[PDB]
Design a protein around this ligand. Sequence first.
Ligand SMILES: [Ca+2]
Ligand SMILES: [Ca+2]
Ligand SMILES: [Cu+2]
Ligand SMILES: [Cu+2]
Lengths: 720, 718
Amino acid sequence: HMVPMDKTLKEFGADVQWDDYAQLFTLIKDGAYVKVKPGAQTAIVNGQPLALQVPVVMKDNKAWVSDTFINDVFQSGLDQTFQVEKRPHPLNALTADEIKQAVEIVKASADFKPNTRFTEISLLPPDKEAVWAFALENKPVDQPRKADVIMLDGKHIIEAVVDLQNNKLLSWQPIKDAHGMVLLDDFASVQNIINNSEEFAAAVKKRGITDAKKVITTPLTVGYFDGKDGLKQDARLLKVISYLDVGDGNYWAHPIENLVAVVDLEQKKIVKIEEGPVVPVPMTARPFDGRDRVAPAVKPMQIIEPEGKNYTITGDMIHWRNWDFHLSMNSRVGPMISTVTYNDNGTKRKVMYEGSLGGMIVPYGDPDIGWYFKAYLDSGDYGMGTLTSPIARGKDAPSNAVLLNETIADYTGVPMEIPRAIAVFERYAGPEYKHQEMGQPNVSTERRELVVRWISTVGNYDYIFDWIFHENGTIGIDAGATGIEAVKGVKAKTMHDETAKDDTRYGTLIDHNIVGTTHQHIYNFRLDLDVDGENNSLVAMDPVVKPNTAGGPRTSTMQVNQYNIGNQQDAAQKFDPGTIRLLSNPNKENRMGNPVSYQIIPYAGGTHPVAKGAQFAPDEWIYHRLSFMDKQLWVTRYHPGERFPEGKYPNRSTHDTGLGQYSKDNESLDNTDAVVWMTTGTTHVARAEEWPIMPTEWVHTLLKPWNFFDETPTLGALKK
Amino acid sequence: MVPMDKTLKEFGADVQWDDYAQLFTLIKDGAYVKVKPGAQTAIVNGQPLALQVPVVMKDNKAWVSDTFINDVFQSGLDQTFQVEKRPHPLNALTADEIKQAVEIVKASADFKPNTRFTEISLLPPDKEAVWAFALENKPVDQPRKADVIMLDGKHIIEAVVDLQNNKLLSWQPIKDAHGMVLLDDFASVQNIINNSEEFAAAVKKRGITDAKKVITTPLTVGYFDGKDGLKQDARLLKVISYLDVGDGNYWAHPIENLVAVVDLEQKKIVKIEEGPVVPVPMTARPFDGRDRVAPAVKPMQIIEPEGKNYTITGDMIHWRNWDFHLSMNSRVGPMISTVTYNDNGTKRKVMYEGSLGGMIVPYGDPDIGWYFKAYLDSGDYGMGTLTSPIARGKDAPSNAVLLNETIADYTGVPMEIPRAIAVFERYAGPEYKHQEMGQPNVSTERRELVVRWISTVGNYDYIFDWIFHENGTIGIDAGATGIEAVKGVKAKTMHDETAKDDTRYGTLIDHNIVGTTHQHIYNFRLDLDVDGENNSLVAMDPVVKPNTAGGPRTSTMQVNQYNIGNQQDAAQKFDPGTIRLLSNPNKENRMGNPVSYQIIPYAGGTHPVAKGAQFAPDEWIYHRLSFMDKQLWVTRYHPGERFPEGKYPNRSTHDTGLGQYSKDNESLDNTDAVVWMTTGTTHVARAEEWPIMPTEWVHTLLKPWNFFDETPTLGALK
Ligand SMILES: [Ca+2]
Ligand SMILES: [Ca+2]
Ligand SMILES: [Cu+2]
Ligand SMILES: [Cu+2]
């Protein structure tokens, strides 16, 4: 029984190329590079021959394969990219079965109710010392596996801990005052509640909208204003902004300006409609999907690895050159990079226990009724892992990437497999080093980087995060932003109209009747670096110009002021990119007697203007609630429950329960387990080039080995 | 018949054999060729080609006709290079024009024996005429001229020659100018040191048994108002010395605190400065892999089997909506000219000429071997002349096209630099994406076109990338790799007695080796013509202001916008939280905003950033080179103002560069402007950079700012 080759291979997600001159198919998926000729008894997979019982059959210019071809070829074993894990790593995420088990254990208590949802079901952090002992010594972890299960019972948060080995509930703790994140069903509830409101339909009608069934809602968290917003603190509320669907696939281009509904999600009712002046809806079609555009005819470019990859993925463990690390997915913050070591001539040296996104915020700058409260805490309030955007193969990542599927719990407690959740890819990155000595043979080597890429979309914006492993020990973390801008409906068509100056006070006029309201993008990364060990110190090195006291003609010299930063409050600081900040191991030295260190660079560049802090006065509630926005470098003492720069429950928070709190007390940062937090931000002033869709803009951060090694790390293995 | 593997390798093509498909794949620059043994046809960039003589296998080796290379690679099916029927007026001097210019000046009775040539370059025609050629095909009327700058012993003379008419137009000695360092000066310095008994005796005192193992490096001496003891009218170089121990890396064996001053006209050492004796660090530190074995790596290829999206017509590059002209200069290297963006069928001016302006690498140590040390790499040494040929597949990706470029050498003889510039297209992540919840994804791929050039001046190697984005952005990135300039010291580790004094001015990166702290400072000269000649400089400073509109917010995000109408105010520190635009106040986009480019002199870097010059303001280097201490400069277009350090910076007594060009109160309002961007790092060394430094980068950007009406990569409308 035969199937059409071209169609079957495309369903499966393989690239299929036919070469009529060579009479050769080239088939590519992930780590498999396959060559096969019609009628041939053998195919080639990653340079190795594979017998085929049934050859590819060509027949009236149409290829047909066996029913078993895809499994015979792609799952043969000749693609060595993925390997089976011997003993399960203790940081492996919860499996589908473990998720279902956690949900049965809590559903077996008297307290569970059928409206009860799950904000997060995740592995409970096992003991760090034990996890490192498993990674470095293969010591089994004796403590049993547990899950944190965070429930939303109507509006109340409850934290449960389940023991998975012994199948029992270990704790069940109500968290008073905490509001829950926004859950997927809240999007539909809001849209339904608005569709059923007579009051809302009348409001919409007086702003020009004839058909209220064409109104698209979007849910926003309301923040906290100590009652100036007129919103009761006890209630589960969301604000709702509206747009008109005109059939262009881009409702974001048709704001219904100055109409905000406040929805109570327990009562399932609109509890308040805020109405400002009437601004006609911008109606012109502004598709971003190409429906109105001519297709480009570009010549092909492929990045090919025809003998397979240089990395191996064993369960969730990635091995690549001198690097080893574990890669898992969390529903709130997305990818977690753990137990990162560097193999230095046979000895695995610790670099990082856990790194991930801490949290992020996109706060707006306009005081009007549709805007004043508007701030996306994308991970904390919406769940960025849950909103992972599957990688578009060859576009969102290069043609030579491997795309990983990842499993998390949805809000009803059912496993969901996110397809193409993460891309892994090696890339050429210019020369690693070069020296052309005059009159001698050249010396050049190529640089290779391993990239781990993940994309999450929250409403209008799409965020790309790259964790970049350099062969030489450097680690990069880059954050990219694309998607559709949040825009304000205005009366001005051009800057010559009467209202233009007022309409553009808080943002640029980027289309007729459309203003891209000014805002910031602020990302924070939590990096539990363990620089060649647990016990580290924060060291400052400030390059300075000093008077020359040594004689000769110079008046000045270049020197460095070096000092330790021994307490947390002083560690929380602005980053001057002219200075050097190290996390050093004062217990271990390189061959020159210098403490082995990593240099921390929270700002290594970007393509939008940089935020030097929060673009808010210090008496703003958002400023008070979210200290992480205003400093670029923080260092705190390791604590397994201090994970989020915005705090665990940021929705309508009244005070800072994140980095403001974690860095508040002054215990010592001297020779102890430190956690580094980097904040990097931009100030986004809009331009017409960014509308109707924004070209990807990037910010860059770096961690560089600083006397961690004894010489150029990529020179190669010593032959004597 | 000739053997295929041997013949194709001498041609510079990559040959791959696939035994399964019985197929040769042959790759060189824009040609991607497939050919089966015995076949009567081949494929070149996806197109069929009839062969006169099939590829023949003899004893499992392939043989081809002796005409095969011409027939296949020069078939016309590779369309990467097209013939230039009407030459662009900024085309660099050809080999024949260089020889002719030299014969014109040699025919003058004023030409003296042994005269050398510091620079032989096109005298650029009139800017208006050049734009009218590029935009309207209008022939330039005035004839081909060359500037010929001669060094007669130590004396500079500037001549101009008319090449069409074959005559000398002018001959002008330049009073008080010192010439740059020329190739023969390196050998003179070495010879002069080798013949000095006095120097050999000094070397002997410092523990060197064989004085013929001493390697010299020539350095310019700068200017210190006589405090260095040095006569201002003499042609001098200072000489720093190293020991050759046979490891290929003399840089790793400094002979510390010994400096010779050579007078190049007298051909003698005129001064020897001798400081404390520090034993030479002796341990072998090769960087070339003689003592190493690389790990095995699986292959990666970047292939474009239908050819390239760019075409190269003479020196004119066309790619997507971009058109520009690429030429080579002996001092500054590549010049990118007449840059337009094709906006829905209409070519719009972006940049008349952009290039490296100049650069400086100045050191922070006051000791005798260091206080004067400041490499003006382009101005003093000639970075174009010192271009490093691209190592194919390593210095640029495997899908690059490598261009040869021709300049004059110091004796006036044309010199063809093989693989002088790389051109390549690269994948650069998604151009944009939106995954609307519950809807089909929208994603498109980003492509960038990179023009890459490498120059090596002594110990350091510099890489410059000019990056054209499809969406109208231009990036300029500068990379540094090579071997650090190091100081010999007594300390082996930071536990030794001298360690603290030894590391006052740099990190201990090896036993007895300190990487002295210094800066890398680059300046780019960018004659942007934003949709036209007449432009203005506009500041937009995002600020937090009190809320006056009501409701709960105490503050708002607003912008202070203002014009910068004077050159003196235009010379400024760059705050990367602000926006600086070059705007065309005569032309607006669809929303009534002036068409503009945003100038970003600091878009990041991998070393610490220089906020300006790491020098007290009474230092002579600080006074001579103002360009070091501000990141943005804007001046009025003048064809003779091209170098931020000045025309003749060797032993300059005052700033004849950007300090002079920006000095006067003249208007930048609605006039032809030139932007200069200074970007730099402060390099504090580490062990990971020794014996060879992994490439470090700095990034700059020019972004269209309401130049267009919408997302520029959406495509043309149906
Ligand atoms: Ca730590
Ligand atoms: Ca201009
Ligand atoms: Cu934005
Ligand atoms: Cu340097």
